[PDB]
Amino acid sequence: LEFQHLIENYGSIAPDALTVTISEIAVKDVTDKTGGGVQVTDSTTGRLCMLVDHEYKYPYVLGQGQDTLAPELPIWVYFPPQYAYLTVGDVNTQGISGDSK
Amino acid sequence: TSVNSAEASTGAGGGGSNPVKSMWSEGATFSANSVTCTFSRQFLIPYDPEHHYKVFSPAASKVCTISPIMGYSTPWRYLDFNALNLFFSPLEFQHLIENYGSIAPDALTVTISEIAVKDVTDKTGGGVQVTDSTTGRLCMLVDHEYKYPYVLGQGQDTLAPELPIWVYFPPQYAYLTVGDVNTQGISGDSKKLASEESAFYVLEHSSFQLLGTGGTATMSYKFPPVPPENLEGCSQHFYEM
Amino acid sequence: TSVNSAEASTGAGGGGSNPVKSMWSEGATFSANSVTCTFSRQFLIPYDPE
Amino acid sequence: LEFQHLIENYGSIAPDALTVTISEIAVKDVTDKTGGGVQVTDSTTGRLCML
Amino acid sequence: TSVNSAEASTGAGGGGSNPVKSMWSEGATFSANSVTCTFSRQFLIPYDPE
Amino acid sequence: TSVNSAEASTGAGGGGSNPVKSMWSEGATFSANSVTCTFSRQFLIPYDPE
Amino acid sequence: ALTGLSTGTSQNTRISLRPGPVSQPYHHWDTDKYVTGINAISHGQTTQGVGRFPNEKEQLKQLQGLNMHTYFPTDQIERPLMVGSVWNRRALHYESQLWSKIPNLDDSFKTQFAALGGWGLHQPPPQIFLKILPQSGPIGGIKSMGITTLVQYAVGIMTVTMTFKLGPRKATGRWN
Amino acid sequence: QIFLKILPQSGPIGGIKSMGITTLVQYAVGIMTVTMTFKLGPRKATGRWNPQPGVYPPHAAGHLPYVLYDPTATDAKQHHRHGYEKPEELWTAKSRVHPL
Amino acid sequence: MPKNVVFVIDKSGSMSGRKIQQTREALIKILDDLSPRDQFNLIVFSTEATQWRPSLVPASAENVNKARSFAAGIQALGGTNINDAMLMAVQLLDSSNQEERLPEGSVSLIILLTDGDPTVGETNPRSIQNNVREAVSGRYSLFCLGFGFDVSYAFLEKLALDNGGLARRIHEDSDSALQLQDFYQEVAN
């Protein structure tokens, strides 16, 4: 609906500002449940590490068309992607095979 | 060794302490020109294992409605207290009708208090046991804007319990919407399918409050001016004046 | 003895209380010259054993 | 002892004032103990009604 | 009854909350005349039974 | 399922936090005209069932 | 089948219009007999069973009784709304709903009182929606977990305060 | 980029036998709230006599997009979408037009 | 006739309590009365599908005792993957066509027990009906046991009918172990 309203009522769009808030953090301990399975409890000593890379120190992997986005519906839990990146290196011939790494 | 080794001793789990004071607010306070009626109920909102939105879509084919109905069921509950006898004990209603010539609604306050989001887990020896959650949240959405289809005041069996000793189980929010009647193939039976006019509301797309255990939130509402109900009858026939 | 001895009773673990209020913030607020769009998602970060 | 002291030292007694304090309230959850019986824990959400 | 009766449900123990913020402080900050070097390690001190 | 399914993992009960600082006070401080002697002991008072 | 006042495109495709307009009773003590309307709604039953109804004696007194014929000299139960009409509404009762939303259609006639009782309101008391925020179960090194939610339920106290405006009693001139 | 991980917690070491080194099984949850402001330009003024084209909502392969529907009510063949459907075109704006 | 019998047993978290106990007790007694010429295997399903031997093994004194110990040791595992469970049992019986051609002259029988509807993996019941019949291809009879009233029995009946067998209801009661034995004796010889 809001996108319909945007394109019905405005001549142009540009990005202006962004705020990301992480809230309601729960680091949850897991342990064995009575009768099998596991049970979960909230941890007062568990910590979530948050690193915001304002300096762009770390290889930027966002904006590559990858299947990593937040869920399209608000009823779905985001499972954020594992951070991994590609770097330059030297091509070494794998012995007699002529295959390369 | 075992704590059972002392026969008059019980094990203790060393639970937490919470020296909060809260009120159970109930009763009618009458005045010359108004009464303030308060009732309280404990409510329970059940575990929902899958927060699905569902389309409510019965078939039609003995009296049917003019067309087959269609709607949506949401994972939200809502509060229904739209009955006079919730606000007055039988004594207080007697006092109202004995002492006053008319009544009109004036103002409403709803307070949700003593919220506990309760974790459930398996008990030793079977069954389940319950613990208070510090990270569990009760979502409260108050629709002051009337964004969402209004389903209160339809004579439905959804009211708060008449006695204060009974736990309110608030109804699941579900509503009917317009749509297009589509013939079900050769059968000639009909269903209302969603159409461009069909309003699909996702309450999670709005902002709402997240309330922890021990949380309180309050709604307040003022009634518009309305004609009072006359509590007094007539000693004459108007055609015999 | 057992709590099961009362058939309409459940055991209780006496968990903690946390009377925090937080918002689920969602929706687009349009204006003449801008829109402010907010969405919220629950996220989960898994246990990594190593 | 105090009643002896009262009747030994005073010619009359009348009630004057009363204060009742309820303190150290614990609403205690009960659940099954490992190996049978029950175990008790303090409840942060349990409430004692006082009227 | 059992929480296992719902197959996509887990038991929950209702643990505590602790909204503290702390830093993992690491790195060398160089300057013309000095460097400030910080490292952090998690440490563990074992149970000593006697 | 079980937490034992990961062999290098332990279950965690999510216990509480209490960032209190206290002193173990011990030692004699001598002065020209006096000494202040402090000792500390842990004490235990047993369960008395009756 | 659907009895009573109803509207639709055919006998098979109708909605009930019960209880009908507030300007008419559906139950009263007539002089020697309880009379109940085909359009009556029951606030529960005495045990299916005998219905529980308001005694609309103030409507019966003012020519609005059930089975009131009107004769146009020809015999019919329907009375049109006439210029210079007077009538009584169905009495408020202990178990009546307090309000209903007046549907925000273009126009309406005398919607101040809802047919089921209480007051018609364009902007009624707002709906309060509640749900528990779903909590994810564990994902990670434990095997076969799948996706789960924490079993959680909520309780609390709903406190509702309603103020009513009260009119004074009318002064009584009677001897008796 | 916002990087997140759970701080690893050591399991017990001490007088208990055979413990090895372990980590506490922990996972994290929370709410990511993202607010983005967009600058919006006004619509261009229209000189036309005839209506602008409709700003049609996009079409789904079956039935209608972005509406939860009961797929058993419709002869559409997108039952695998369980009655919530994306349009088969991407929804692009630019329906209204102005001269050069 | 010597027979090749495969048992497919739900181990969802809904089975906890009497149902898992009575099912296990019936399986122990069924295993104890097996004849030395029969071949068998056991498939458990929940969210995950798990097989005791992944192939048909002879009803030797050692194999029957090891199977009874497995039946005693297995625990419940949450959700319900009925499609994988049936396909795994079918795959083990269909091993007779290629790997094990010596038990081809035996009577093949597939028995499935469940207390609930599919909740893990393929949950479209029409797709599951297709998947089972295309795998079995009329080679042997499928007997589906609906334990309790918390299951789509008409789905179980249609599936058994499409595959040369019949379904049977098991009533949640004190005698459920006997009801399972009573049914098995109808098809045991």
Curated annotation (Swiss-Prot), chain I:
This is 70 kDa inter-alpha-trypsin inhibitor heavy chain H4. The chain holds residues 271 to 459 of 930 of the full protein. Glycans are attached at residue 4. Residues 2-162 form the VWFA domain. It comes from Homo sapiens (Human).
